[PDB]
Design a protein around this ligand. Structure first.
Ligand SMILES: NC(=O)NC(NC(N)=O)C(=O)[O-]
Ligand SMILES: NC(=O)NC(NC(N)=O)C(=O)[O-]
Ligand SMILES: NC(=O)NC(NC(N)=O)C(=O)[O-]
Ligand SMILES: NC(=O)NC(NC(N)=O)C(=O)[O-]
Lengths: 287, 287, 287, 287
């Protein structure tokens, strides 16, 4: 009977930007994949196709490049500039979501202007503005890790559908996908990112794992305990199964040496670790 | 400050299942990619690695195959059986999230047991159980559509960074990604999915588009107006740009015939169309 | 000590082109992914960086779009025009390789200008020119098929590394990738493509498979025996394993009904079926 | 008329193996993606479905894991053992093709048994046996590199379809894909791979590029001149376009700082650099 326009947003996604800093012979590279989306009063655009309030996605894209010309210290600083621009520049635009993936490059033998991609991880940043408030979530993804031992899994309940054998020595491999929310915008973004990355890696490697859930809890705890500016961290860790191959059919034993790395299916353990007393469900997680 | 375990869930993801129905010589094929995750009291598993409450992800996987043996009418009904099983079977398991992608197959020349994959779209279903509440969201993805005409875009504000020109004839191409939430589990799931797919395609094709936002609104309205069992539908539609190539430098015109289909960037228009008065932010959308 | 420039080629790869035919209200869509590479005397370009003979890849790109404006009967006809243009338009260019992927679209409810992608298969074409000689290879890929029965596999040798049990009833699933070489350019390309596709599907479905190798042989035989303009057809067929899940542990049985579709590893069966007397190793297969 | 079985091969593709060396607390990891295909007399398998000569692909897979138990010094040595086993172990198997991708891992803070994946490049190896002849090709792929300056492109011919402006300062970005053929099995495979990688990177970075063709030529020349065990090296280098954004409409200049990194299309330059007088078209390149 009665239809209503609910939450909505729009903009330009995946604007690939490469900013070269070359004021001197020592060139610097910043490589981003940027997405911009606006929120506000776009009722008529949807119900009547009246585009008076529709800042073209093409325009949003042009703005990303125009702002890049001035340079930016960090990815987060760049997103903050964009968000402020759109929200304050148009009265009907009350907020939005600006995100970016940051790709890393290393110099080729310390060369001044020749680099190679470091594809071992991807950094992410998301800024959400709502009225007079804003929140930032930083993250890391695509970071694959593995422990060849120091991982166990036993003591689980058994039912008629249970066939898994307990173990005190197995491989624990996963893809680190973590995202943390800052409780302030006054942060040394690059320093905290480097710190968090190291904390996650350290907790993963040094925690004698009795469960993937436990390892994840330790990784999250290390981050919250170390950085006051972080209120919560969310992680999604797949348990990439490395099956110990049965070689007895061929007359050989397998002392935890030969494994089959299966693609699918995979365990998927996810959790939110929070600072006691912090917000329970911030809107930025809705996406 | 102290660290606290917040929202969390775990299970087996992407369990690929193929169920063949062969009671008669006329075989039937059901092809699914299933994910199972439980929610409940898993505090100890995280803080101490105590797995007493941890129904192994391997066990969850076995349960999917065991249940498939009995057959299932629809993907949603299969998920409902799984969800009820885990929630009712373990006191500490209070709910969960079960999802699946359904892949379509067509018979080869009406053959009794030879088929070919229809890859033009993928059907999805997500079930979330919270206590006695059962919420289901069905959807479609990977369905690419295009209108060669019947699309315009003008009347947008021209700010200092706007270079896009107004037009009364352009291509409108997108990938239909839609998800709708049922307000009841007593639905003819297959019939509604077919109807919804048809309504979306119809609105996309017959609406003279003045904006992607308008086309999306009409698609959503048609669904809600036609199906009382649906409370809301959310869509995420990219505007996959097909740029009219400028051939004038080569001494030729281009009467809306030759286009360059760009990969990135792309416009991304998203919105929720709701039945007036329905729930604003159902938890199932958080994932 | 002494180095020599061997085989070489360069050009523009993956030029996405969409050609709309709209002389009438009944629009038509041709969607291609085109690649152009030239061969000839580019010695100086490599050893000295002398670009006198280097027709810019950007120029090759522009040519694709400029030629598309005139329209084309089939993809092969389009590649023929491009190859002729480059080899004859430049003295130092003696040949090249022009290829394309063709994507299929279906009308939405028979609409005049609204379509949806048929992603169930991708058509390919490759043209190679060498001096005054040219050859065309057409193909199909991405077409997934499956037989739920009518497939056996027994009688294979059993060495100390063999554990596979023989069977007279298993699922046979694969992705049809086939390419065939024409012995003449005067062909009804569209009609032959549709015919070949049908013959491959028919042979796959109606052949009681004793081995994937036999099924493939029968598929290729059908093609060669049906089309005089085809001298050989090459196929690469993966055996996408669907494992019968063991349900005995759950007190059940599995009468060829419940399967686990594994991603990797997979069997890979490949072969060339040719017309007796035809060329053994045509250069076009080198790429 | 008369149909004949031509070249053919079959086996198991993409067997994911992880071999852990743990004789001491200092664990080592070897991660491979292995493919095994046999060649020989398989006539009856194709024409009659007689599997007497068909060593099951499952058996080939089992052999890979059983052989891994004994360990291997290098990927090439591992493939060599496999090839000899199958050709020598079965009279009707006269040759084959064994290949593998090798994935790299780095220790986490020098941990004894905790690692993270180095996804910046993938090492490859292919062995082909044809009767008494053996040939090995090693390679590297997925290595993305970029020069922010030190690249020019001018002096190219200009026809009616040329719009590209000459330049003396542009970005040169590509994905390094190279494969080289050894002329002997007496090679320190790991040492040569590390050396070739360094030579390719060094040549790419230090060569003032007047054309991608020239840069590639220098990369190849360096490898051949340095390693007597290599007879030829083939490269496929895309020119991943980074377009200098025009900000003049906004009254801003862009001194080679802000770029748009386009996905497709892309230039694709390929060449073979050979030791003078070596084999022109070795069969291994055909696949
Ligand atoms: N907003 C639109 O309907 N058209 C589009 N055009 C713009 N905004 O540049 C888009 O990308 O979706
Ligand atoms: N539950 C399991 O079968 N094992 C797993 N390991 C855990 N939960 O620590 C996993 O996630 O696959
Ligand atoms: N060769 C076959 O027909 N069947 C297959 N089964 C084996 N060889 O294990 C396969 O993988 O293709
Ligand atoms: N040939 C070149 O060196 N640069 C390129 N630029 C052209 N040819 O337009 C390319 O795409 O490879």
């Amino acid at each position: 009977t009665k239809v209503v326009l609910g939450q909505n947003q729009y903009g330009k996604a995946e604007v690939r930007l490469v900013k070269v800093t070359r004021n001197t012979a020592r060139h610097e590279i910043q490589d981003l994949n940027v997405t911009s989306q606006l929120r506000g009063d776009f009722e008529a655009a949807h119900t009547a196709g009246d585009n008076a309030h529709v800042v073209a996605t093409d325009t949003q894209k042009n703005t990303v490049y125009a702002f890049a010309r001035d340079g930016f210290a960090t990815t987060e600083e760049f997103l903050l500039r964009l968000g402020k621009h759109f929200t304050e520049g148009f009265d009907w635009v009350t907020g939005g979501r600006w995100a970016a993936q940051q790709f890393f490059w290393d110099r080729i033998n310390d060369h001044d202007h020749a680099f190679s991609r470091n594809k071992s991880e991807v950094r992410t940043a998301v800024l959400e503005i709502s009225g007079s408030e804003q929140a930032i979530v930083a993250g890391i993804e695509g970071l694959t890790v593995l422990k060849s031992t120091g991982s166990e899994f036993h003591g689980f309940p058994r039912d008629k559908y249970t066939t898994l054998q307990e173990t005190t020595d197995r491989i624990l491999a996963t893809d680190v996908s973590a995202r943390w929310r800052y409780n302030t915008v006054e942060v040394d973004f690059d320093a905290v990112y480097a710190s968090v990355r190291g904390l996650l890696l350290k907790a993963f490697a040094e925690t004698h794992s009795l469960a993937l859930q436990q390892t994840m809890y330790e990784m999250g705890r290390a981050v919250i305990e170390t950085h006051p500016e972080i209120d919560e961290i969310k992680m999604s860790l797949p348990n990439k199964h490395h099956f110990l191959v049965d070689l007895q059919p061929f007359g050989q034993d397998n002392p935890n040496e030969v494994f089959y790395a299966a693609d699918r299916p995979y365990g998927l353990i996810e959790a939110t670790i929070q600072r006691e007393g912090s917000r329970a469900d911030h809107p930025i997680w809705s996406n």
